[PDB]
Amino acid sequence: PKLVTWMNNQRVGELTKLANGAHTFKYAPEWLASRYARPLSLSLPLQRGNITSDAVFNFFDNLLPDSPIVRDRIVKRYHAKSRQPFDLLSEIGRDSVGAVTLIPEDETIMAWEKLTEARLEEVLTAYKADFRISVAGAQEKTALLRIGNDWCIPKGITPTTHIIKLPILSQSVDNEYYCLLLAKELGLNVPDAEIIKAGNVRALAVERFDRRWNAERTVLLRLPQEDMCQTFGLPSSVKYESDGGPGIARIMAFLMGSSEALKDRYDFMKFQVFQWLIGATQGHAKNFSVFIQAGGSYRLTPFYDIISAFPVLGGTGIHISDLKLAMGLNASKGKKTAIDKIYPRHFLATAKVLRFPEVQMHEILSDFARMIPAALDNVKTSLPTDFPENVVTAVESNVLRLHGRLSREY
């Protein structure tokens, strides 16, 4: 059938699934007529006819969790017609990443339901074992609306405000909380987050940057954005560079066209050094996104889904020398990927071939060189008393070891 695509009460167009299985999208005339029109994706440019490219299927598929196990749970929950994407979005497409609201064609203000601690625990635990929310991730996360100090279920098409993550890596909630705090302390653009507790559940609540309250707090708006697989028209299956996905060079080139090119290229390169320092090995293409602005211009969103592989070291069998960056750097004979083998020279060499000013690359390295020690100390003040000590020890010790390569040079 057809899923009507809305962006904050404005009709954008309709998604169709053909009898032959193909997915097509058509923009609404009224959307195309606006002087402030913007495409749903840079892979789906504004145009009048039916769009039938694989970019249509890929774009909407990328709104859903990557995991087949998670999709099975979704079908079971809402009695979805099938496992196919169009049918999943027919059930949970009301509140998605970005501003796309999908509502069945056979269907015709701000309100919410406050959750008691008991009902919150109930709602959240239900995920490990008016609620049509879809979240893009690797595990099974959901979303809720925060009103003051209470967690709530939005009614109708009222949006959510926070992405909620449960433990994966049994300490992933604590791991990400720590990494988000550290990134913020070092000047990176990342969302604020908090550890929430509902009875026996411990989850991470991350503020959404694809949502914005108006000044009077009477309307909560959704903000359009898409991830790198979506912008390049790619399936989530190629999110890693080794599978054909975009790496540093492709993304840096794309950012030359951002409405904030200078700042975004600098922030993206700074984030590569940060990931190296904290041992983040899952910085694939879906971990980066851009806001789509009026007319189709774009700029990088904050970074997110940040987790260190350091707390997983030793434990089973993973060794420090086994940790690799998802997006490799330039090396004299190819690429440099091992965190334990990377030095300032690799970042400078990468900057050189990508036309990123050497003075800017030096500034980034020198800033981490003098700020890291104090930043690791400052984060402690924001950790609860029940925060796992092994996570702090693992990350701190390894960050300091690599930081030594920066301080010696700067």
Contacts with Cl ion by CB under 5 A lie at 336-338, 341
Helix 358-379 with 389-407: angle, nearest 10 deg: 150
The residue among 41 and 337 lying less far from Cl ion, judged by its C-beta, is 337
Residue type, position 347, single letter: F
**Residue at shortest CB range from Cl ion:** 338
* Closest to Cl ion by CB, 315 or 334: 334
CA angle 358, 359, 360 (to 5 degrees): 90
Asked if residues 124 and 116 have their Cβ atoms less than 8 Å apart, the reply is no
Residue ranges of alpha helices (H) inside 163-293 are 172-185, 228-231, 248-255, 261-278
Instruction: Pick between residue 131 and residue 343 the one whose CB is nearest to Cl ion.
Output: 343
- Phi, psi dihedral angles at 185 (to 5 degrees): -60, -30
Contact 234, 325 (CB under 8 A): no
**For Cl ion, which is the closer residue by CB, 321 or 390?**
321
Minimum CB separation of residue 39 from Cl ion in Å reads 39
What's the closest the beta carbon of residue 332 comes to Cl ion, in angstroms? Answer: 11
Smallest distance, Å, CB 337 to Cl ion? 5
Given the complex with Cl ion, which of 336 and 403 has the nearer CB atom? 336
Quote the CA–CA distance of 320 and 309 in Å, as a whole number. Answer: 9
Task: Tell me how far, at minimum, the Cβ of 331 lies from Cl ion, in Å.
Answer: 6
Helix (H, G, I), strand (E, B) or coil at 150: strand
Q: How far is the CB of 202 from Cl ion (least distance, A)?
A: 36
H helical segments located in 213-260: 228-231, 248-255
* Least distance in angstroms from the C-beta of 324 to Cl ion: 7
259 in Cβ contact with 299 (< 8 Å)? yes
